[PDB]
Design a protein around this nucleic acid. Sequence first.
RNA 1: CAUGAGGUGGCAAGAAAUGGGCUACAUUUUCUACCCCAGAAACGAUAGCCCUUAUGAAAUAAGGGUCGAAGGUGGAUUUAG
Lengths: 101, 122, 87, 132, 108, 20, 192
Amino acid sequence: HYVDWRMWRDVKRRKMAYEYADERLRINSLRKNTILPKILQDVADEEIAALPRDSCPVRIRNRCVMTSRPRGVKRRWRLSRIVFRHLADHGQLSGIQRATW
Amino acid sequence: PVVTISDEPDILYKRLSVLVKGHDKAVLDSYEYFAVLAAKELGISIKVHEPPRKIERFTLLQSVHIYKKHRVQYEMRTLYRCLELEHLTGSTADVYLEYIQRNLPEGVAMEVTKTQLEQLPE
Amino acid sequence: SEYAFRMSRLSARLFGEVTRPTNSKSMKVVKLFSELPLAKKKETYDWYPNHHTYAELMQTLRFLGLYRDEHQDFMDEQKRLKKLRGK
Amino acid sequence: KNRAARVRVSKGDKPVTYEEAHAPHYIAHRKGWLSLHTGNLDGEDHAAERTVEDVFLRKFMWGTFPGCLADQLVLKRRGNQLEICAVVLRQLSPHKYYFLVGYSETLLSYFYKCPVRLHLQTVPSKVVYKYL
Amino acid sequence: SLWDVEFAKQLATVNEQPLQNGFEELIQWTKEGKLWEFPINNEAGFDDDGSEFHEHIFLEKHLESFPKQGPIRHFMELVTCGLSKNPYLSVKQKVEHIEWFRNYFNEK
Amino acid sequence: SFFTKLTADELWKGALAETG
Amino acid sequence: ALPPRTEKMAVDQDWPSVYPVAAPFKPSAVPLPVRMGYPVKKGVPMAKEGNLELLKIPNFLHLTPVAIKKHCEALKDFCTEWPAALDSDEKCEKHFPIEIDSTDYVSSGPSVRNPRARVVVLRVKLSSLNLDDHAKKKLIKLVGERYCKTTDVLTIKTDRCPLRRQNYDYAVYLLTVLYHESWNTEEWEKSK
RNA sequence: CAUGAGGUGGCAAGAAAUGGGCUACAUUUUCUACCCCAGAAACGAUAGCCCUUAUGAAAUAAGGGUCGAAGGUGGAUUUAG
Ligand SMILES: [Mg+2]
């Protein structure tokens, strides 16, 4: 009942990130120093590596909510430049008017 | 009815500024007028100025597929209105806000109310 | 200047922030703790709203008889036609 | 040939309503915005969230009121409110409509945690602007 | 006392009239807790268990015991500072984080 | 999904294909 | 059933009761024959009794001037008038030093949680503080980007903790501690 | 029991041809000051090479050294105002 499998995957990834975020942050903190030993840093890195992928925050791709398309997606509305346009034209978004300029 | 009076000192608000953002100009004007009518009636010295409109613009493709040159650009305008109120007791100010904030127009009209305290030094 | 340094230190102490001197690298940690992480932001985890809920509820409503997915009805009709046919 | 919302001249038969008969370039000019909320002003938050809700609501209304919406809705918000103005045909019995309305109010309210109170506009036929 | 409750309910019912006006409706809504308490605070709730700034910011107390000369301590201090700088995390959360860190340290 | 759905008229039009 | 409450409406009437609270248009309720729309090439602006445009308009059918006046009259209670601390802000300054000034935003929708509202600054005049000799020399040194020289105004800004009141409290405390520090000179000071 | 779904790894490099950009080829210039009265000079800036920095689980960008190509105003033709 999401639009496609890609969307579902994305959602799952997001969920994973939400679950494991704090820990990840902590590990990054541990890593990213000149303060404190090298061995410890190495260990931290190893731990991070071990931690499962998709919990990774970078794999989180932005799509449109309505049509599962990755590009032309305004982050202000979270919808594609087709869907958004459609919304705009009928007049279903307040404020959005055509730039006569 | 039923107001009551506490024994504690009421809080003092100085030059209470209020900035109304809106999409449509006429509506904003009307709102301003209403505010003026209110405040004056109450017994509050106020004034109004209109700070300059902002227009965030952004462009996207007219087609679905290919055809790059051919674009459509949108804009979402916002115009402002100051409503700076010169000197009042705190309760009164609150009441005024209530009168205003409840019955402001829908979506269009969004005020930002910079209240300004005074107090003793500590 | 030593006096200036001392003053700076004092200021830092007053305003909570890093008192002991350090690099641009170690400030990263501080920044991180100041911020939320990218994954815990309400834009991120709640980017796609529910969806499942929206669908399921609609379906339930349709079943009840208080709402009509016209598209869904059309699809059903098509399916029926197919069944009648070939299939 | 740009051809977004603009309904197309086929003959002199097509009965078209005022919102329906006006191209997107008129939105500020000879038309108004259907939805109304603070999100799209700047700087201001929670636009995306609102948009989805708006999209949902119209659809829901259509589902509920089948052949009983003359023209597209008007969604409004005032703090913690969600007012709706639906132009409805005088087709069904009023009792049925009443039954529907309360249900819609309750269901929507429970969904969005926002007291809805929609107000209907009974008109016998679709209000024609042009026979396009 | 269920009987008492029932009686009260009955009394309430007896008292009732219809909605009368829009103002009345609004009042009712307010009483219920559906509408907001004007003028708006952007606060109502979210009280953070009576914190009073020092509980959020000054983390000498929540720092706990560990060697006060090494790089580890510096790191901890930095972390504390970061936490203090933070608004969005609660009082509990910061403390929890600190505890976790401590545990980790102990483990090594 | 629910948002991927749409009105009936459009669907009908699509089906018919009476506009080459 | 007719155009009711329009054909049977009195010329000269308590209008505020017909539209008390803000609501949509309702052309049956409204007596005015308003025509809202762009005219057709050789026709008329669209009639009252079935327009979307009218509905769309945010409306001030409530808040008629008379109604507003009445409301004001009703609310002459709730309103303790402020004393003779006078205009010009000189007298006030003399009496009340310090100027705290936190904002609060009123957005639409189900939530009211806007972070921006929590922030608070504390603009206090340094001459109006009036208890510093050597501390004037030290306070400035302590407090870098704040303290304007054209108008002697210390302006601490608090953005750390979530609540507004707590932030304010912190700011107050910050100021006090700063003052104390300025007053209480250290030993190392001498190396100027 | 697959043109469906999930996982791990990978996939993009040019013998070439051609399109559209950027940068030059210098003295109306190059460098430094100043952002338009100055003082010096007699270019160009990739390709790599190493070294950092940023990002991020993980190297694409940014800076510094080094190096320091071709090019020494462009043919038939053609592009814009
Ligand atoms: Mg064109």
